[PDB]
């Protein structure tokens, strides 16, 4: 018969990162989480208590509770044609502050800066991100860069 245990299929998912077995280093416990924080889940195999079920491996959620040795992360997992809300109780070994919003927070603070500099100066801020534009025209000189003429090569073996 089939087998569908809590940790089935998880040979390498929970594996330990080559040459990085052993006790978890101390910064992992010195980190500090608060409500609203955005964390990424990645289970640590050595720490079997407080583990996330494999489904939330690789997933990113928001902290909704802070307790002695653990955090509560809500995840939107989708079952059927909808999403449902999932409260996870994870130990601090499997959670990691997400840089998925560092750039945004960076962009806000640098956008307040540019805006103050614009308002203190003359107007025309223009601070929305814009996608990769096509190149502008350019002139390419041939000085010391005369074009070489390549041809396709004949068949060979050298086995």
């Amino acid at each position: 018969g089939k087998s569908h245990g809590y940790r089935s299929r998880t040979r390498y998912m929970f594996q330990r990162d080559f040459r990085k077995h052993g006790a978890v280093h101390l910064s992992t416990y010195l980190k500090v989480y608060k409500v609203g924080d955005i964390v990424d889940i990645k289970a640590n195999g050595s720490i079997q208590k407080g583990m996330p079920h494999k489904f939330y491996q690789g997933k990113t959620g928001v902290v909704y509770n802070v307790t002695k040795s653990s955090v509560g992360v809500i995840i939107n997992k989708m079952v059927g044609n909808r999403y449902l809300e999932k409260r996870l109780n994870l130990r601090v070994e499997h959670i990691k502050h997400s840089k998925c919003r560092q750039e945004f927070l960076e962009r806000v603070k640098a956008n307040a800066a540019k805006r103050a500099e614009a308002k203190a100066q003359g107007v025309a801020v223009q601070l929305k991100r814009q996608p990769a534009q096509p190149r502008e025209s350019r002139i390419v000189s041939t000085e010391g860069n005369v074009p070489q003429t390549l041809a396709p090569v004949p068949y060979e073996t050298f086995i």
Partner: protein, 58 residues
């Protein structure tokens, strides 16, 4: 007489007719499952500030 065992065929089709609905975010989510020792204090901490605000409109 055997018959088909299982398939996920057409299931995403159906799932998308009224298809996948975003999780409907709210301001002020619930405290469901939040640490009781925190919630107990938090209650009085809200009772007080409320009493404090009513005291600005004495």
């Amino acid at each position: 007489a055997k018959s088909k065992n299982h398939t996920a065929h057409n299931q995403t089709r159906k799932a998308h007719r009224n298809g996948i609905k975003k999780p409907k975010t709210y301001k002020y989510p619930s405290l469901k499952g939040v640490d009781p020792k925190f919630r107990r204090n938090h209650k009085h901490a809200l009772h007080g500030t409320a009493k404090a605000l009513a005291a600005a409109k004495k």
